[model samples]
Target chain A: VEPTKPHLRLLPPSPEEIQSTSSATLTCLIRGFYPDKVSVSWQKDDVSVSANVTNFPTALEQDLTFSTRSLLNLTAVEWKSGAKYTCTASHPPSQSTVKRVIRNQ
Target chain B: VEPTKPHLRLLPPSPEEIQSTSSATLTCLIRGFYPDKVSVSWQKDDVSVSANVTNFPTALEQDLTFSTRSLLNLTAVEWKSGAKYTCTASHPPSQSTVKRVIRNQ
Candidate 1:
């Protein structure tokens, strides 16, 4: 059987939460998928960027599915400058991947 | 969207782990689903039995789906006797349920 695709969302940093957390806190919540072999990474515009991405342990949900939180760290310059950031989660088995975009004005 | 159904399996104790753990450890691994609000319970011979069942937290898998481990404790008599045990996981939103049966021979 094919693998399950994930629901991906990019959560932009709120100034209140960002002020204390890091230069910028961009979290990508990818949940509700199967096969449990997904990859989460950050991208700049369209190209995959080399950044510090933290992929937390996938946590089991009540539905027996899996959910994971991937965090991207940005600097003040990256936060203030106009940049289009993307968070992508991919489940290769299912040929499933979701990309969420965020922009800083 | 409809809720996801779980892949349920009853893992029989290896006997090595059972002696050290408890009278008998019947673990049910329910994985790859969503919504995180499913209820897991145990039954004896298709009858809803009130017994001590351990439902671990829903864990996030690498695929962003969720998985949970449910444990049913059985006494020595219960383990030795011929009793059919079932672990059922229900997802109300999806109207989905999976029952795994295990019996000690």
Candidate 2:
């Protein structure tokens, strides 16, 4: 595999979907690839968002799949307030980005 | 101790001084504080320098000193190139800010 190839899930749903403020688990998953030396970050309007939370990476899957999850302390933001957030996965081989909005009461 | 005060070292030898790029450890130190809720960032001409570089924080000192250093792979940048870099320590006392602080800190 080339060092700089990004395999997209191909129209695998837009990253920007409305997220409900309800207490539940929200995950931005990245699939496919190996040696997952990627950086996943959050931002607002091109500005880095300081997530006062923690992040942990999960081991890659059996068939060249790797993933990591960054948990956002969601309740910190007042509910029902429309706000934009993003999740980005940057690997030395390739880079993919995704963004979403908080929608709900 | 006053809740909102910065005890700056009297002209503590301008933070902007010449540094030898060879055979020396460069340090940016912050002293006197507890709970150690302060931000120290390095920037050059208003730009943050990336440290593929790692950063580690030392334990709080016996006399309330909190210091963290971000190490730069010196070989990354050609030294003696005359760069204006800054190491700033920021603490949000009452949730407000001052000039420059609002921008960089």
Candidate 3:
């Protein structure tokens, strides 16, 4: 029943294929803490990305913890250039914030 | 909001200090997930551990995701022997489970 602090880890993108394909997927994975409520957002080269961004609700873990993810879908031209993509996670209660950044290869 | 699957990562214990101290702490970190409802548990030598176990609630992250942690406290004598310790995470809605193991040095 105690609140726990969360850790954030963003999954890296497939640069080679992402640029080649019509579209690519970006994910930010957060783990290692608890409480079910959190916020997620996206950024491209330090500029906030609003369209084509999807935030998922927190899911249950087998060990009595919680987890969630944020996904961004972009065109090959948009992602192919290898812009800086950032995923930010914020926990209000603990006042903890974490960010994961991905750059094209 | 969409639902995302969670990833589990167990932090390794400080074997040298753990064995030398009166008690040792073990943690299981869960990340990159959604729904914010998960479970956490501990095991020793393949047997479930009940006492001195703490399951912290899910907390918020900076990027709108969630994270959680589980702590297991064991006496130096018990942990110094390099017994097998496992941290199991389960997200019921997704019916997905992950486990991480650490052995004393």
Candidate 4:
């Protein structure tokens, strides 16, 4: 079996857009990989933000590969303070991680 | 190794919301499963939509399970026709499929 390694992408809110709402969602979109085994975690400023973190189910693509999303819900205050939010995904062959920093305008 | 069967979910656009835009996205969120191998396909009214289909990479969740999403892009005309759109996923042990119908209303 050909094992596909994951490609990671972080879908963060637009930094230029105004944060008018109380909370926003940060999605870590993992694509194009295999083995169906990985670990996901979220951290704020290097500290783990374990609460309110939800990992959706894994999806099988037409190409015989898999994809999934992990969501982090944070308040406007927490997001606008220029804090760093990192999503770490670990699996066989390699461990992938991506981070987003909310910049104050 | 234990093979975890997949659970399927389709995230369709809101029927009540007005389709003012020319195109909208329909996402199939598949979650809570294992093995990292799956086949995904899209069908409209039982016919296949093979073009413009993109499947993101498979994600490994913290629990060693996998998750992924397949997205279908439809124009306002295509979506408002009340045509049925289906997401079919096939893996070992069982094959799962889900469908969504766009209403004229």
| TM-score to native of every candidate shown | 0.49, 0.35, 0.48, 0.48
The full ranking of all candidates by DockQ, starting with the best, is: 1, 4, 3, 2
lDDT (10s digit) by residue, model 1, range B1-105:
556778885755534334555577676768778766788989888888657688778775666566777878777567778788888999776788888777673
Local error of candidate 2 at residue B102 (angstroms): 43
Model 2 Cα lDDT, one tens digit per residue, A1-105: 644333321111111122333332223434454566766665544667765434555443434455444544444233235345455667765554444332322
Q: Rank the candidates by lDDT, best first.
A: 1, 3, 4, 2
**DockQ values of all predictions:** 0.14, 0.01, 0.04, 0.08
CA-lDDT, candidates in order: 0.73, 0.40, 0.71, 0.64
Query: How good is the docking of model 3, by CAPRI class?
Result: incorrect
Q: Name the candidate that leads on lDDT.
A: 1
| i-RMSD of all predictions | 21.0, 22.6, 11.5, 11.5
lDDT of 4 by residue, B67-105 (tens): 677878776677668777777777664444434333221
User: Each candidate: how many clashes?
Assistant: 17, 0, 64, 21
TM-score of 3: 0.48
Stretches off by above 4 angstroms in model 3 are A14-21, B1-105
Ranking 1 against 4 by TM-score, winner: 1
Candidate 2 wrongly placed segments (more than 4 Å): A3-26, A76-79, A95-105, B1-105
